[PDB]
Design an enzyme around this catalytic site. Structure first.
Site, PDB file in Angstrom:
ATOM      1  CG  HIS A 143      -2.011  -1.193   1.067  1.00 41.27           C
ATOM      2  ND1 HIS A 143      -1.617  -2.316   1.629  1.00 41.27           N
ATOM      3  CD2 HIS A 143      -3.133  -1.431   0.263  1.00 41.27           C
ATOM      4  CE1 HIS A 143      -2.429  -3.272   1.133  1.00 41.27           C
ATOM      5  NE2 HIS A 143      -3.311  -2.854   0.470  1.00 41.27           N
ATOM      6  CG  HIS A 173      -5.338  -1.512  -2.450  1.00 44.86           C
ATOM      7  ND1 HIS A 173      -5.890  -1.910  -1.491  1.00 44.86           N
ATOM      8  CD2 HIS A 173      -6.121  -0.263  -2.474  1.00 44.86           C
ATOM      9  CE1 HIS A 173      -6.711  -1.391  -0.693  1.00 44.86           C
ATOM     10  NE2 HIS A 173      -6.925  -0.252  -1.259  1.00 44.86           N
TER      11      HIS A 173
HETATM   12  C1  LIG Z   1      -3.213  -5.704  -3.944  1.00 49.10           C
HETATM   13  C2  LIG Z   1      -3.866  -5.803  -2.395  1.00 49.10           C
HETATM   14  O1  LIG Z   1      -3.498  -4.571  -1.667  1.00 49.10           O
HETATM   15  C3  LIG Z   1      -5.598  -5.676  -2.474  1.00 49.10           C
HETATM   16  N1  LIG Z   1      -5.997  -5.506  -1.383  1.00 49.10           N
HETATM   17  C4  LIG Z   1      -6.125  -7.095  -3.019  1.00 49.10           C
HETATM   18  O2  LIG Z   1      -6.129  -8.033  -2.344  1.00 49.10           O
HETATM   19  N2  LIG Z   1      -6.608  -6.937  -4.344  1.00 49.10           N
HETATM   20  C5  LIG Z   1      -7.145  -8.246  -4.833  1.00 49.10           C
HETATM   21  C6  LIG Z   1      -8.154  -7.796  -6.142  1.00 49.10           C
HETATM   22  N3  LIG Z   1      -9.145  -6.954  -5.558  1.00 49.10           N
HETATM   23  C7  LIG Z   1     -10.388  -7.479  -5.271  1.00 49.10           C
HETATM   24  O3  LIG Z   1     -10.710  -8.418  -5.489  1.00 49.10           O
HETATM   25  C8  LIG Z   1     -11.212  -6.358  -4.689  1.00 49.10           C
HETATM   26  C9  LIG Z   1     -12.739  -6.869  -4.643  1.00 49.10           C
HETATM   27  N4  LIG Z   1     -12.890  -7.852  -3.444  1.00 49.10           N
HETATM   28  C10 LIG Z   1     -12.884  -9.264  -3.763  1.00 49.10           C
HETATM   29  N5  LIG Z   1     -12.866 -10.229  -2.888  1.00 49.10           N
HETATM   30  C11 LIG Z   1     -12.864  -9.712  -1.645  1.00 49.10           C
HETATM   31  C12 LIG Z   1     -12.889 -10.883  -0.686  1.00 49.10           C
HETATM   32  C13 LIG Z   1     -12.925 -10.416   0.627  1.00 49.10           C
HETATM   33 CL1  LIG Z   1     -12.863 -11.686   1.873  1.00 49.10          CL
HETATM   34  C14 LIG Z   1     -12.635  -9.279   1.135  1.00 49.10           C
HETATM   35 CL2  LIG Z   1     -12.666  -8.815   2.835  1.00 49.10          CL
HETATM   36  C15 LIG Z   1     -12.600  -8.185   0.153  1.00 49.10           C
HETATM   37  C16 LIG Z   1     -12.847  -8.544  -1.036  1.00 49.10           C
HETATM   38  C17 LIG Z   1     -12.828  -7.388  -2.139  1.00 49.10           C
HETATM   39  O4  LIG Z   1     -12.652  -6.299  -1.877  1.00 49.10           O
HETATM   40  C18 LIG Z   1      -6.427  -9.148  -5.214  1.00 49.10           C
HETATM   41  C19 LIG Z   1      -5.042  -8.931  -5.914  1.00 49.10           C
HETATM   42  C20 LIG Z   1      -4.198  -9.729  -6.562  1.00 49.10           C
HETATM   43  C21 LIG Z   1      -4.501 -11.244  -6.087  1.00 49.10           C
HETATM   44  C22 LIG Z   1      -5.514 -11.765  -5.191  1.00 49.10           C
HETATM   45  C23 LIG Z   1      -6.167 -13.079  -5.178  1.00 49.10           C
HETATM   46  C24 LIG Z   1      -6.609 -13.440  -4.195  1.00 49.10           C
HETATM   47  C25 LIG Z   1      -6.950 -14.756  -3.702  1.00 49.10           C
HETATM   48  C26 LIG Z   1      -6.837 -15.758  -4.626  1.00 49.10           C
HETATM   49  C27 LIG Z   1      -6.867 -17.152  -4.299  1.00 49.10           C
HETATM   50  F1  LIG Z   1      -8.143 -17.413  -3.824  1.00 49.10           F
HETATM   51  F2  LIG Z   1      -6.127 -17.770  -3.446  1.00 49.10           F
HETATM   52  F3  LIG Z   1      -7.184 -18.023  -5.508  1.00 49.10           F
HETATM   53  C28 LIG Z   1      -5.896 -15.298  -5.658  1.00 49.10           C
HETATM   54  C29 LIG Z   1      -5.572 -14.185  -5.991  1.00 49.10           C
HETATM   55  C30 LIG Z   1      -6.349 -10.600  -5.243  1.00 49.10           C
HETATM   56 ZN   LIG Z   2      -5.141  -3.642  -0.522  1.00 47.60          ZN
END
Ligand SMILES: C[C@@H](O)[C@H](N)C(=O)N[C@@H](CNC(=O)CCn1cnc2cc(Cl)c(Cl)cc2c1=O)c1cccc(-c2ccc(C(F)(F)F)cc2)c1
Ligand SMILES: [Zn+2]
Ligand SMILES: C[C@@H](O)[C@H](N)C(=O)N[C@@H](CNC(=O)CCn1cnc2cc(Cl)c(Cl)cc2c1=O)c1cccc(-c2ccc(C(F)(F)F)cc2)c1
Ligand SMILES: [Zn+2]
Lengths: 401, 401
Positions: A145, A271
């Site tokens: 961040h 982010h």
């Molecule tokens: C870069 C970081 O600082 C940022 N905070 C972040 O995590 N961004 C998200 C992509 N962004 C979103 O998906 C935002 C929308 N979203 C989608 N799913 C959620 C799920 C939860 Cl539980 C919560 Cl608390 C919030 C959210 C949420 O806000 C991101 C980026 C890159 C990779 C992943 C990712 C996450 C999980 C997986 C897995 F599940 F293992 F397959 C694979 C990839 C997610």
């Molecule tokens: Zn973030």
């Protein structure tokens, strides 16, 4: 062949069990790859002037309620209670990073503040849709961040773009598709703020001579994003990188800095993740290389092996020299045929097998065989060690000639 | 005054907050210490021929019921739910290590198998009993489990003891109290098994000439143990190190290996931690040194600074040389008096302050001051870098005298 789940079992990298759905048991050789990827990302964090922090695994639901994520993603979150208090297992690192930002009075002089973490996150994902290292419940993000002024967004996004292409080039990913997601129907702030926010991302990409396209209306409630999609050698698409502007979370979690005019201001949050999920990125590399990990990533980089018992002490000395040079080396001194040894270590995808016969010992040289089955002939021990060191330091995709 | 909470705040190492009771936010400089401590432990894990692994964050309550810990300690565990299945946030790393062991056919030749992990653990401790980094809820164990034969217990306990004193001596801890806890009333196995098990621990300590006091009847039902208590400079006792024999968990979790007789046998397990909690150990070290961390642990090892703008280029060049040498170094070219700069870096407990005046630039030298206030005078840049590299790589408690 190019199935990370098969190659994973074969090279003893990881396994998984129903007792812990979508959460990886990292074996010795798998954890070695993971740790070397961490070392690589840390080298870029230093090069791009990032702090590295570590936040707790759980925080009070009350705190997560202030983020807005509770209402929208409560069912995607693992919860646990203690002493009449409910805690969320962190699915994201952002609120944790704001808590560290909020410790101490912050000045405009502290911005841009770049906060990186290898953030161990957990999401309550449907078990039916879990697939190896690609779709998991427990994952590690190469997360960061950036807290900055509105004026600093362009320069900070510029540096994020360079870091993305810089890091992808290391693994041989040169075909990158870039998409800018614009203001959705339901969005915070004025149309002007969004014009400037979208302009900042567009100009940052232009400044890097990067062609891209729009994903119209696909932007988040709290700001626009850039997404990066890399193409492997099979020309398969993997969305990994994201740069997301956030005009919501800092304010929500009472993040402030003393401006140059002495007025209290809310910082802009960026982010960004480049590899995305470390586990998924290892999954992708495993298939990309088909187990033939570049030397700097290889669990075992060199096996030194004798033809007969006569070269055992020369092998012990050479193995010690390689160990001292920081190379991940094993000695194969088993009473087995040289052919058997080469075939076994070739199947385990060891980059280099250093073969010692009487002629090698007598000349103070070593016969170098690659896992691709090429014989590089007999070379001076010290010259080979210097070359292996150069290939590892430079994180070269290619082997010696 | 040597409160780790005060030093932690002042040197921006870490913080803790009510939204996350007994769980640590590691800031940049504190996480640098944590990682260097990790790097140190890994150097020992290599020397004593340990594998390093990573297990999942949570596992099914069903598995924790097989261990026997649920009936006894369920109230001390955090639990979460998903798809009508109950999961325990791991309070210990042993069960997870057995799962990795159980994967793949293990023979007598694979033993002793030494499995280390920096294990993220959580205990549901009463929030009233939490204080500082000493009593926490989230901790990182320098944990390992040794899978061996009854024949191998003595030698394996021997190496465990050597590793303990090896590591405690690095930090200057020579006053170690040792306790062996023998047969409880309720126990598993024969009295002959316990006779051998208690002898193995006792003979290991006697051969190493380690004075120990028997804790008669206070041993665990699953086997006997050695506990190591170290004393700090205030003569305060810290029970950090453990070596615990276990003739129960391997059987309960279906752990077996193919013996020399080509028949299946249950392996003996040795639970072994030396630091105990990485977080508590950093807390003890913080107080032991009162923030004056040995050079190898110091967040910032060197500050290079100028008298006037004239030496600015020489400072930036020396900074880069020290960086290339592998030293955590920062430049201070600010327009401030030398006495102001030196006080800031002394307050921050920077081991070495390198001052560049005209005479230093001309002669290719640098003026070296310690945070203790010792002026070592003007010395050759290359000779200083070699001395610093040596101090860091040797992990010396002492600075240049
Ligand atoms: C870069 C970081 O600082 C940022 N905070 C972040 O995590 N961004 C998200 C992509 N962004 C979103 O998906 C935002 C929308 N979203 C989608 N799913 C959620 C799920 C939860 Cl539980 C919560 Cl608390 C919030 C959210 C949420 O806000 C991101 C980026 C890159 C990779 C992943 C990712 C996450 C999980 C997986 C897995 F599940 F293992 F397959 C694979 C990839 C997610
Ligand atoms: Zn973030
Ligand atoms: C060396 C390891 O492989 C071994 N498995 C182990 O964890 N040993 C225990 C010491 N042993 C015991 O406490 C045994 C008795 N006991 C005590 N409390 C428990 C609590 C729970 Cl929740 C469970 Cl599942 C089991 C137990 C349990 O078995 C140990 C050793 C060193 C430090 C700690 C420790 C204890 C508490 C903290 C805390 F401060 F709470 F964060 C931090 C660290 C624990
Ligand atoms: Zn254990």
């Amino acid at each position: 062949g190019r199935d990370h789940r098969k190659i994973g079992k074969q090279l003893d990298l990881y396994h998984m069990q129903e007792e812990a759905p979508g959460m990886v048991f990292w074996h010795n050789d798998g954890w070695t790859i993971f740790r070397e990827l961490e070392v690589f990302v840390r080298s870029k964090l230093k090069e791009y002037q990032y702090q590295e922090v570590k936040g707790p695994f759980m925080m009070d639901r009350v705190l997560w309620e202030k983020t807005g994520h509770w209402d929208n993603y409560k069912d995607a979150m693992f919860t646990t209670s203690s002493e009449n208090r409910e805690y969320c297992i962190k699915p994201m690192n952002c609120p944790g990073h704001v808590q560290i930002f909020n410790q101490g009075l912050k000045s405009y002089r502290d911005l841009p503040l770049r906060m990186a973490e290898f953030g161990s996150c957990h999401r309550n994902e449907p078990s039916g849709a879990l697939h190896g290292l690609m779709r998991v419940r427990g994952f590690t993000q190469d997360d960061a961040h950036i807290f900055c002024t509105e004026e600093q967004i362009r320069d900070e996004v510029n540096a994020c773009i360079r870091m993305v292409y810089d890091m992808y080039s290391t693994f041989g990913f040169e075909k990158i598709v870039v998409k800018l997601s614009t203001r959705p129907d339901k969005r915070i702030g004025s149309d002007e703020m969004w014009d400037r926010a979208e302009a900042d991302l567009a100009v940052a990409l232009e400044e890097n001579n990067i062609p891209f396209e729009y994903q119209l209306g696909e932007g988040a409630f709290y700001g626009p994003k850039i997404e990066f999609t890399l193409y492997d050698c099979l020309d398969r698409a993997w969305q990994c990188g994201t740069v997301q502007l956030d005009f919501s979370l800092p304010s929500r979690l009472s993040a402030s800095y003393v401006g140059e005019d002495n007025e209290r201001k809310v910082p802009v949050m960026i982010h960004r993740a480049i590899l995305g999920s470390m586990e998924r990125f290892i999954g992708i590399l495993t298939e990309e290389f088909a187990g033939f990990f570049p030397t700097w990533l290889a669990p075992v980089q060199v096996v030194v092996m004798n033809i007969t018992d006569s070269q055992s002490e020369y092998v012990n000395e050479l193995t010690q020299k390689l160990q001292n040079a920081g190379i991940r080396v094993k000695a194969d001194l088993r009473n087995e045929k040289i052919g058997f040894k080469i075939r076994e270590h070739t199947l385990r995808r060891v980059p280099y097998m250093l073969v010692c016969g009487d002629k090698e010992v007598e000349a103070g040289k070593v016969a170098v065989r690659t896992r691709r089955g090429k014989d590089l002939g007999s070379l001076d021990v010290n010259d080979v060690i210097e070359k292996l060191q150069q290939e590892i330091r430079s994180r070269s995709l290619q082997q010696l000639e």
